[PDB]
Amino acid sequence: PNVSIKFQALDTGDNVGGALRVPGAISEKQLEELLNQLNGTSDDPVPYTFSCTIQGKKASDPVKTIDITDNLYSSLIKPGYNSTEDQITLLYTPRAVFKVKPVTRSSSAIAGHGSTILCSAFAPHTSSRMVTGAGDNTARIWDCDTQTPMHTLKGHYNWVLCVSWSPDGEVIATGSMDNTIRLWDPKSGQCLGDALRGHSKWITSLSWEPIHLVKPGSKPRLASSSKDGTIKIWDTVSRVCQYTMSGHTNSVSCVKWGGQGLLYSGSHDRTVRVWDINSQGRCINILKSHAHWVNHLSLSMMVTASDDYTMFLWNPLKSTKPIARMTGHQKLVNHVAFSPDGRYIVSASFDNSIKLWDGRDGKFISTFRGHVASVYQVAWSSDCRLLVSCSKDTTLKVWDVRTRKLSVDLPGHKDEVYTVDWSVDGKRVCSGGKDKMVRLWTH
Amino acid sequence: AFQKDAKSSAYSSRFQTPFRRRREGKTDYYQRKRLVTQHKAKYNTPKYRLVVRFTNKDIICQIISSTITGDVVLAAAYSHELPRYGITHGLTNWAAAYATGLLIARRTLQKLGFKVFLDIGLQRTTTGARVFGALKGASDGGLYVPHSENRFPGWDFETEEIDPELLRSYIFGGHVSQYMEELADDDEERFSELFKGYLADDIDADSLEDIYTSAHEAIRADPAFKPTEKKFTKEQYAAESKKYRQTKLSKEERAARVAAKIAALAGQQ
């Protein structure tokens, strides 16, 4: 008994072709070793990960990877198709990296911002720095390691609604009700002198392209969205307003940039606008669809989550027509994590459920259940592998992406977790409740 | 000793000696029982203690487990390794305890691809003690070491509250620099006596936090434990050591010594 294999690439990335035959007895670990040899990537710690054979709505589970190939060949899900039963179909994509020994004493808490609110940033990787923003009108830079406050940035006239952090970690940006954004030096805790005026109303959201790949003529910029209904693109180094994007009737709740060339905005006027930031200031496309206010955005694909609890996926860059309408959540989806990550989207909703979606297919991979109340934030913590979600039920749970099963849950008596940031090593949670403390878990 | 003290046959005959490790004042068997013994239905599942011990100026962290033949070291780190990571002074302070503890966690947790309990030994549990420094480092390091916060410095007595601005300050040697500051303009008599080496290597205060801050980085970067090079073998150390160890006797030699003695001490000078 042998298998014929047919592998076709999924997503932009590696390409290879040629069927290859391997014996039937072989395990998944052996199948990848044969495939990777062909691909020309080595048999190093590179996992090379599989997804299979499109379908699995049925009575049964469909086609898991790890099942031995002779067993799959007989019975994929059905016995297969007419065109299978002869081949096995593999979609191959990297990530992903391992962390070993978990550990566990209770997280250090760092008290701060009295009873306050809204933003969190953790510079992933080397950066130990965590930045919390609050209605208290200040921001605080903290050490993930020490869990002591490095500094508090006390420039703003009022409440800080949003922030952006550069991977260097050296620059911090904030948006306040005072209607200005400020650029700060996280180490010094010194205002850049960067006070950016121009917005009339509160600066609700911002996305920053920390570094610009393109020639120095173009520099790093931050885009901001405001209640005023407009967005502005700012030069971090020289605090100037390069362009203003007008055209939104209602407040701009969410924006994505870093596109370095594409500005994506979601507003209360139930519209999603795609923009050409550079000297033009013109909105090339307006995505119409959402019955209600657009709360969240992801920009690979363009994905919008609305109050009308629908999520729309938008096709390639010029056409402006919707790929698919994802339904199923009951209420407002607070946040979604979408990326080039295999075109996989994870959405957190008020409905207290979280869903994993295949943006290409439109299929719902799975829904995570078990949280009591609305889901405030999420991250694909481990990677493709793990999803981390936070809720009112004071819980940050770790879930298995593949199974959609719940592995374990973090918090007890407290109030709630507003948001989370996750690094490979640790999790930072901003919590609120009567007695407050931000939590830093290490593993 | 004292003539009317002294010990009867009968005292000695019925004396029950305590263990040995107790006679040595080194083992609290009562606490050891409870640290070591495992749930009977988790069978051969070893119960690993993180042992933290302070000598007159070296810190010891071993991860240890038990066996009816003897205990068993999994991992060991000593604060005297810390020169390896850019730490040269005050290595029995709260921050060297933290550092060493982080070195212990990172090292073992490495060679493993982990739950563990604090063996404080005979240390008092005072709030701010540095045994608990070890603990923080092993815990910030990645181990699951079950513990509470009320023995870390900057624990408010008269309220259930931790000031972590303070506890950070200890991890990094902040109380040492602040003394080192304070001594730079109220007394340089003493500042040259203690804090001597800091002059001798030009490390004045303010930097102290960076030394440790990057001792941390250095550690996670390469925890894998360098044994000393050695210089002289097993055999030599042995041989030169036997130059200084008296060796017993034969009954025959002892026999002569008495016979010899009754030759002297006795037959009328």
Short mmCIF file of all heavy atoms in Angstrom, two decimals, chain A residues 136-276, unseen atoms left out:
data_model
loop_
_atom_site.label_atom_id
_atom_site.label_comp_id
_atom_site.label_asym_id
_atom_site.label_seq_id
_atom_site.Cartn_x
_atom_site.Cartn_y
_atom_site.Cartn_z
N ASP A 136 -7.64 58.82 32.97
CA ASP A 136 -7.10 59.65 34.02
C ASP A 136 -6.26 60.74 33.41
N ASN A 137 -6.09 60.70 32.07
CA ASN A 137 -5.36 61.68 31.31
C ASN A 137 -3.89 61.37 31.28
N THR A 138 -3.47 60.18 31.75
CA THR A 138 -2.06 59.93 31.69
C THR A 138 -1.83 58.59 31.05
N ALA A 139 -0.53 58.26 30.87
CA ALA A 139 -0.11 56.99 30.34
C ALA A 139 1.02 56.57 31.21
N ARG A 140 1.27 55.25 31.33
CA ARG A 140 2.36 54.86 32.16
C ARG A 140 3.15 53.82 31.44
N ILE A 141 4.49 53.94 31.51
CA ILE A 141 5.34 52.98 30.87
C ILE A 141 5.78 52.05 31.95
N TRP A 142 5.67 50.72 31.71
CA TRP A 142 5.98 49.82 32.77
C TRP A 142 6.97 48.83 32.26
N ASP A 143 7.60 48.09 33.20
CA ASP A 143 8.56 47.09 32.87
C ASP A 143 7.84 45.79 32.99
N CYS A 144 7.80 45.02 31.90
CA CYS A 144 7.15 43.76 31.98
C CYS A 144 7.93 42.92 32.94
N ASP A 145 9.28 43.04 32.92
CA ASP A 145 10.12 42.25 33.78
C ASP A 145 9.98 42.60 35.24
N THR A 146 10.25 43.87 35.62
CA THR A 146 10.22 44.31 36.99
C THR A 146 8.82 44.50 37.47
N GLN A 147 7.93 44.95 36.56
CA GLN A 147 6.57 45.23 36.90
C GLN A 147 6.49 46.46 37.76
N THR A 148 7.47 47.37 37.57
CA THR A 148 7.47 48.63 38.27
C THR A 148 7.23 49.69 37.23
N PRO A 149 6.58 50.77 37.60
CA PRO A 149 6.37 51.83 36.64
C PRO A 149 7.60 52.63 36.35
N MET A 150 8.02 52.68 35.06
CA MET A 150 9.16 53.48 34.66
C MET A 150 8.83 54.93 34.73
N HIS A 151 7.68 55.33 34.17
CA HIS A 151 7.37 56.73 34.12
C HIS A 151 5.92 56.90 33.82
N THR A 152 5.43 58.13 34.03
CA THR A 152 4.07 58.42 33.68
C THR A 152 4.12 59.63 32.81
N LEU A 153 3.45 59.58 31.64
CA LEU A 153 3.52 60.69 30.75
C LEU A 153 2.38 61.60 31.06
N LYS A 154 2.69 62.80 31.60
CA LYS A 154 1.64 63.68 32.04
C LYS A 154 1.60 64.91 31.18
N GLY A 155 1.33 64.79 29.86
CA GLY A 155 1.12 65.95 29.03
C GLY A 155 -0.30 66.41 28.85
N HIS A 156 -1.21 65.43 28.64
CA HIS A 156 -2.54 65.68 28.12
C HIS A 156 -3.49 66.37 29.03
N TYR A 157 -4.34 67.19 28.37
CA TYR A 157 -5.41 67.95 28.95
C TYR A 157 -6.49 67.02 29.39
N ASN A 158 -6.80 65.96 28.61
CA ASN A 158 -7.83 65.11 29.13
C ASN A 158 -7.53 63.65 28.94
N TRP A 159 -8.60 62.85 28.76
CA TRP A 159 -8.60 61.41 28.72
C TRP A 159 -7.85 60.88 27.53
N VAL A 160 -7.05 59.81 27.73
CA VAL A 160 -6.32 59.22 26.65
C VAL A 160 -7.09 58.04 26.16
N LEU A 161 -7.65 58.15 24.94
CA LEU A 161 -8.40 57.11 24.29
C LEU A 161 -7.58 56.09 23.55
N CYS A 162 -6.40 56.45 22.99
CA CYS A 162 -5.71 55.45 22.21
C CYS A 162 -4.23 55.71 22.25
N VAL A 163 -3.43 54.71 21.81
CA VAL A 163 -2.00 54.85 21.82
C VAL A 163 -1.43 53.93 20.78
N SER A 164 -0.17 54.19 20.37
CA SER A 164 0.56 53.37 19.45
C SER A 164 1.95 53.31 19.99
N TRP A 165 2.65 52.20 19.74
CA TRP A 165 3.98 52.03 20.27
C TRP A 165 4.84 51.55 19.14
N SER A 166 6.09 52.04 19.08
CA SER A 166 6.98 51.63 18.02
C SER A 166 7.71 50.44 18.51
N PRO A 167 8.10 49.55 17.65
CA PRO A 167 8.82 48.38 18.06
C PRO A 167 10.13 48.75 18.65
N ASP A 168 10.70 49.91 18.28
CA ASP A 168 11.92 50.30 18.90
C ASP A 168 11.54 50.45 20.33
N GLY A 169 10.33 50.98 20.54
CA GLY A 169 9.75 51.11 21.84
C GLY A 169 10.11 52.44 22.37
N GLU A 170 10.99 53.14 21.64
CA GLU A 170 11.47 54.44 21.98
C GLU A 170 10.43 55.49 21.77
N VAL A 171 9.44 55.27 20.87
CA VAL A 171 8.48 56.32 20.69
C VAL A 171 7.10 55.82 21.01
N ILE A 172 6.31 56.68 21.69
CA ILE A 172 4.96 56.37 22.07
C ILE A 172 4.10 57.46 21.52
N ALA A 173 2.87 57.11 21.10
CA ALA A 173 1.97 58.09 20.58
C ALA A 173 0.68 57.96 21.33
N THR A 174 0.00 59.09 21.59
CA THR A 174 -1.23 59.00 22.32
C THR A 174 -2.27 59.88 21.70
N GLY A 175 -3.55 59.53 21.94
CA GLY A 175 -4.65 60.28 21.42
C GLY A 175 -5.52 60.61 22.59
N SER A 176 -5.94 61.89 22.69
CA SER A 176 -6.67 62.30 23.85
C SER A 176 -7.93 63.00 23.44
N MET A 177 -8.85 63.17 24.41
CA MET A 177 -10.09 63.86 24.22
C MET A 177 -9.78 65.31 24.00
N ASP A 178 -8.59 65.76 24.46
CA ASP A 178 -8.13 67.11 24.36
C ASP A 178 -8.00 67.46 22.91
N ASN A 179 -8.12 66.44 22.03
CA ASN A 179 -8.14 66.58 20.60
C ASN A 179 -6.76 66.62 20.04
N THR A 180 -5.73 66.25 20.82
CA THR A 180 -4.44 66.27 20.21
C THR A 180 -3.80 64.93 20.41
N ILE A 181 -2.80 64.63 19.58
CA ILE A 181 -2.03 63.45 19.75
C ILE A 181 -0.68 63.93 20.15
N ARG A 182 0.04 63.15 20.97
CA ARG A 182 1.33 63.59 21.37
C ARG A 182 2.29 62.48 21.11
N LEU A 183 3.55 62.84 20.82
CA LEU A 183 4.56 61.84 20.61
C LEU A 183 5.49 61.96 21.76
N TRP A 184 5.81 60.81 22.39
CA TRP A 184 6.58 60.85 23.59
C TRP A 184 7.77 59.97 23.44
N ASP A 185 8.75 60.16 24.35
CA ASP A 185 9.92 59.35 24.39
C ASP A 185 9.68 58.42 25.54
N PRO A 186 9.47 57.16 25.32
CA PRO A 186 9.24 56.32 26.46
C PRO A 186 10.34 56.24 27.47
N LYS A 187 11.62 56.30 27.07
CA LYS A 187 12.64 56.21 28.07
C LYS A 187 12.66 57.45 28.92
N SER A 188 12.70 58.64 28.27
CA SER A 188 12.78 59.91 28.94
C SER A 188 11.49 60.20 29.63
N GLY A 189 10.37 59.88 28.95
CA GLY A 189 9.07 60.20 29.44
C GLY A 189 8.87 61.65 29.13
N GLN A 190 9.51 62.11 28.05
CA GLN A 190 9.52 63.49 27.67
C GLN A 190 8.68 63.66 26.44
N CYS A 191 7.85 64.73 26.43
CA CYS A 191 7.05 64.99 25.27
C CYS A 191 8.03 65.32 24.20
N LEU A 192 7.76 64.81 22.99
CA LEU A 192 8.58 64.96 21.83
C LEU A 192 8.57 66.41 21.53
N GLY A 193 7.56 67.10 22.07
CA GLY A 193 7.34 68.47 21.75
C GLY A 193 6.38 68.31 20.64
N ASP A 194 6.06 67.02 20.42
CA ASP A 194 5.16 66.63 19.41
C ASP A 194 3.80 66.72 19.98
N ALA A 195 3.13 67.85 19.73
CA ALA A 195 1.75 67.94 20.09
C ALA A 195 1.10 68.14 18.76
N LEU A 196 0.16 67.27 18.37
CA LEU A 196 -0.34 67.44 17.05
C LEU A 196 -1.74 67.94 17.11
N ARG A 197 -1.96 69.13 16.51
CA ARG A 197 -3.24 69.77 16.49
C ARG A 197 -3.86 69.50 15.16
N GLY A 198 -5.15 69.84 15.01
CA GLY A 198 -5.82 69.62 13.76
C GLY A 198 -7.11 68.90 14.01
N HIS A 199 -7.14 67.94 14.94
CA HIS A 199 -8.41 67.32 15.17
C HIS A 199 -9.22 68.18 16.09
N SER A 200 -10.50 68.35 15.72
CA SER A 200 -11.44 69.10 16.50
C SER A 200 -11.94 68.29 17.65
N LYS A 201 -12.28 67.00 17.40
CA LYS A 201 -12.91 66.18 18.39
C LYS A 201 -11.96 65.09 18.81
N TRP A 202 -12.40 64.24 19.76
CA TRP A 202 -11.53 63.28 20.39
C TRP A 202 -10.89 62.34 19.42
N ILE A 203 -9.60 62.04 19.69
CA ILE A 203 -8.87 61.16 18.83
C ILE A 203 -9.01 59.78 19.39
N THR A 204 -9.99 59.06 18.81
CA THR A 204 -10.42 57.74 19.16
C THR A 204 -9.47 56.63 18.81
N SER A 205 -8.87 56.65 17.60
CA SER A 205 -8.05 55.51 17.25
C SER A 205 -6.90 55.94 16.39
N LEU A 206 -5.80 55.14 16.37
CA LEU A 206 -4.68 55.46 15.54
C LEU A 206 -3.90 54.21 15.25
N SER A 207 -3.24 54.15 14.06
CA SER A 207 -2.41 53.03 13.70
C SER A 207 -1.11 53.60 13.23
N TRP A 208 0.03 53.01 13.65
CA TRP A 208 1.25 53.67 13.28
C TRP A 208 2.15 52.75 12.52
N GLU A 209 2.78 53.29 11.46
CA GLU A 209 3.75 52.56 10.70
C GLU A 209 5.04 52.98 11.32
N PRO A 210 5.49 52.23 12.27
CA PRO A 210 6.67 52.59 13.01
C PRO A 210 7.82 52.91 12.13
N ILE A 211 8.11 52.03 11.15
CA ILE A 211 9.23 52.25 10.29
C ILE A 211 8.73 52.19 8.89
N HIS A 212 9.32 53.02 8.01
CA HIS A 212 8.88 53.03 6.65
C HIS A 212 9.95 52.38 5.84
N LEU A 213 9.58 51.31 5.11
CA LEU A 213 10.51 50.57 4.31
C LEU A 213 10.98 51.45 3.19
N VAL A 214 10.04 52.23 2.62
CA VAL A 214 10.31 53.04 1.47
C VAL A 214 11.32 54.09 1.84
N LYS A 215 12.02 54.60 0.82
CA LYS A 215 13.08 55.57 0.93
C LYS A 215 12.70 56.65 1.89
N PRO A 216 13.72 57.22 2.48
CA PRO A 216 13.61 58.18 3.54
C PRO A 216 12.74 59.33 3.15
N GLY A 217 12.45 59.51 1.85
CA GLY A 217 11.58 60.58 1.49
C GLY A 217 10.31 60.34 2.23
N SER A 218 9.89 59.06 2.28
CA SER A 218 8.74 58.74 3.07
C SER A 218 9.28 58.32 4.40
N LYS A 219 8.62 58.76 5.49
CA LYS A 219 9.11 58.46 6.80
C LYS A 219 8.03 57.72 7.51
N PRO A 220 8.26 57.46 8.77
CA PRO A 220 7.24 56.80 9.55
C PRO A 220 6.08 57.70 9.81
N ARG A 221 4.85 57.15 9.72
CA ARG A 221 3.70 57.97 9.96
C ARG A 221 2.72 57.22 10.78
N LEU A 222 1.85 58.00 11.46
CA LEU A 222 0.76 57.53 12.27
C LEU A 222 -0.47 58.08 11.67
N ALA A 223 -1.56 57.28 11.64
CA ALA A 223 -2.81 57.77 11.13
C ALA A 223 -3.73 57.80 12.31
N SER A 224 -4.57 58.85 12.40
CA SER A 224 -5.45 58.95 13.53
C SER A 224 -6.86 59.10 13.05
N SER A 225 -7.81 58.56 13.83
CA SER A 225 -9.21 58.66 13.53
C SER A 225 -9.80 59.45 14.65
N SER A 226 -10.86 60.23 14.38
CA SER A 226 -11.40 61.07 15.41
C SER A 226 -12.90 61.09 15.33
N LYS A 227 -13.53 61.64 16.38
CA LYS A 227 -14.95 61.80 16.49
C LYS A 227 -15.37 62.82 15.47
N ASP A 228 -14.43 63.71 15.09
CA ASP A 228 -14.68 64.76 14.15
C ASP A 228 -15.01 64.19 12.81
N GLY A 229 -14.74 62.89 12.59
CA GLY A 229 -15.15 62.28 11.35
C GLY A 229 -14.03 62.32 10.36
N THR A 230 -12.81 62.71 10.79
CA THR A 230 -11.74 62.78 9.84
C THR A 230 -10.57 61.99 10.35
N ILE A 231 -9.59 61.77 9.45
CA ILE A 231 -8.39 61.06 9.80
C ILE A 231 -7.25 61.92 9.36
N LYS A 232 -6.11 61.85 10.07
CA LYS A 232 -4.98 62.62 9.66
C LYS A 232 -3.77 61.74 9.73
N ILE A 233 -2.80 62.01 8.83
CA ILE A 233 -1.59 61.24 8.79
C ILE A 233 -0.51 62.14 9.28
N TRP A 234 0.31 61.65 10.24
CA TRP A 234 1.26 62.53 10.85
C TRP A 234 2.63 61.93 10.74
N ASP A 235 3.65 62.81 10.72
CA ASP A 235 5.04 62.46 10.66
C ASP A 235 5.52 62.41 12.08
N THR A 236 5.96 61.22 12.53
CA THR A 236 6.38 61.06 13.89
C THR A 236 7.60 61.88 14.18
N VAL A 237 8.60 61.87 13.27
CA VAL A 237 9.83 62.57 13.54
C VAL A 237 9.59 64.05 13.57
N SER A 238 8.96 64.60 12.51
CA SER A 238 8.65 65.99 12.49
C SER A 238 7.19 66.00 12.67
N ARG A 239 6.69 66.56 13.79
CA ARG A 239 5.31 66.45 14.15
C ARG A 239 4.48 67.32 13.24
N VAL A 240 4.29 66.92 11.97
CA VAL A 240 3.54 67.73 11.05
C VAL A 240 2.42 66.87 10.52
N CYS A 241 1.34 67.51 10.02
CA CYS A 241 0.21 66.79 9.51
C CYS A 241 0.32 66.73 8.01
N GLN A 242 0.74 65.56 7.49
CA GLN A 242 0.96 65.39 6.09
C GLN A 242 -0.33 65.42 5.31
N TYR A 243 -1.38 64.67 5.73
CA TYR A 243 -2.58 64.72 4.94
C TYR A 243 -3.80 64.56 5.79
N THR A 244 -4.95 65.06 5.27
CA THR A 244 -6.19 64.95 5.97
C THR A 244 -7.14 64.20 5.09
N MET A 245 -7.83 63.19 5.66
CA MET A 245 -8.74 62.42 4.87
C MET A 245 -10.13 62.75 5.31
N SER A 246 -10.90 63.43 4.44
CA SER A 246 -12.24 63.80 4.80
C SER A 246 -13.16 62.98 3.97
N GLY A 247 -14.46 62.93 4.34
CA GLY A 247 -15.38 62.12 3.58
C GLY A 247 -16.22 61.27 4.49
N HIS A 248 -15.83 61.08 5.77
CA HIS A 248 -16.67 60.31 6.64
C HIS A 248 -17.64 61.24 7.31
N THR A 249 -18.94 60.90 7.23
CA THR A 249 -19.99 61.66 7.85
C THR A 249 -19.97 61.49 9.35
N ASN A 250 -19.71 60.26 9.84
CA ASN A 250 -19.78 60.01 11.25
C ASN A 250 -18.41 59.73 11.79
N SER A 251 -18.34 59.53 13.12
CA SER A 251 -17.09 59.37 13.81
C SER A 251 -16.35 58.17 13.30
N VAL A 252 -15.00 58.26 13.31
CA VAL A 252 -14.17 57.19 12.84
C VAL A 252 -13.72 56.43 14.05
N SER A 253 -14.25 55.20 14.21
CA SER A 253 -13.94 54.35 15.33
C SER A 253 -12.66 53.58 15.17
N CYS A 254 -12.36 53.08 13.96
CA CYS A 254 -11.23 52.21 13.84
C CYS A 254 -10.47 52.54 12.60
N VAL A 255 -9.14 52.30 12.62
CA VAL A 255 -8.37 52.57 11.44
C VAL A 255 -7.23 51.61 11.40
N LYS A 256 -6.76 51.28 10.19
CA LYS A 256 -5.60 50.46 10.12
C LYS A 256 -4.66 51.10 9.17
N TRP A 257 -3.37 51.08 9.52
CA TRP A 257 -2.39 51.63 8.65
C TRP A 257 -1.20 50.77 8.85
N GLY A 258 -0.02 51.24 8.42
CA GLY A 258 1.12 50.38 8.49
C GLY A 258 1.08 49.69 7.18
N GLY A 259 -0.01 49.96 6.44
CA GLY A 259 -0.21 49.47 5.12
C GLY A 259 0.88 50.10 4.34
N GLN A 260 1.28 51.32 4.79
CA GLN A 260 2.28 52.04 4.07
C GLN A 260 1.81 52.14 2.66
N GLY A 261 0.72 52.90 2.45
CA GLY A 261 0.20 53.03 1.12
C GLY A 261 -1.28 52.87 1.13
N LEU A 262 -1.86 52.13 2.10
CA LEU A 262 -3.29 52.03 2.11
C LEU A 262 -3.77 52.45 3.46
N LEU A 263 -4.77 53.35 3.51
CA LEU A 263 -5.34 53.74 4.77
C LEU A 263 -6.71 53.14 4.74
N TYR A 264 -7.10 52.47 5.85
CA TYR A 264 -8.35 51.76 5.94
C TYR A 264 -9.07 52.33 7.12
N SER A 265 -10.35 52.74 6.96
CA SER A 265 -11.03 53.37 8.05
C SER A 265 -12.42 52.81 8.20
N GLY A 266 -12.93 52.75 9.45
CA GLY A 266 -14.26 52.27 9.71
C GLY A 266 -14.93 53.32 10.56
N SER A 267 -16.17 53.72 10.18
CA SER A 267 -16.78 54.80 10.91
C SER A 267 -18.19 54.47 11.29
N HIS A 268 -18.77 55.35 12.12
CA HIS A 268 -20.09 55.25 12.65
C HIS A 268 -21.09 55.40 11.55
N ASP A 269 -20.66 55.89 10.37
CA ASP A 269 -21.60 56.06 9.30
C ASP A 269 -21.73 54.79 8.52
N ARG A 270 -21.46 53.65 9.18
CA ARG A 270 -21.59 52.32 8.63
C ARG A 270 -20.81 52.17 7.37
N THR A 271 -19.69 52.92 7.21
CA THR A 271 -18.96 52.77 5.98
C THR A 271 -17.53 52.45 6.29
N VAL A 272 -16.85 51.80 5.32
CA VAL A 272 -15.45 51.50 5.44
C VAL A 272 -14.79 52.14 4.25
N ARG A 273 -13.76 52.97 4.47
CA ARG A 273 -13.18 53.68 3.37
C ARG A 273 -11.76 53.27 3.18
N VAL A 274 -11.33 53.11 1.91
CA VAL A 274 -9.95 52.80 1.68
C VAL A 274 -9.36 54.05 1.11
N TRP A 275 -8.10 54.39 1.48
CA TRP A 275 -7.63 55.69 1.10
C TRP A 275 -6.24 55.61 0.54
N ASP A 276 -5.88 56.64 -0.25
CA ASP A 276 -4.53 56.81 -0.73
C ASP A 276 -4.04 58.03 0.01
#
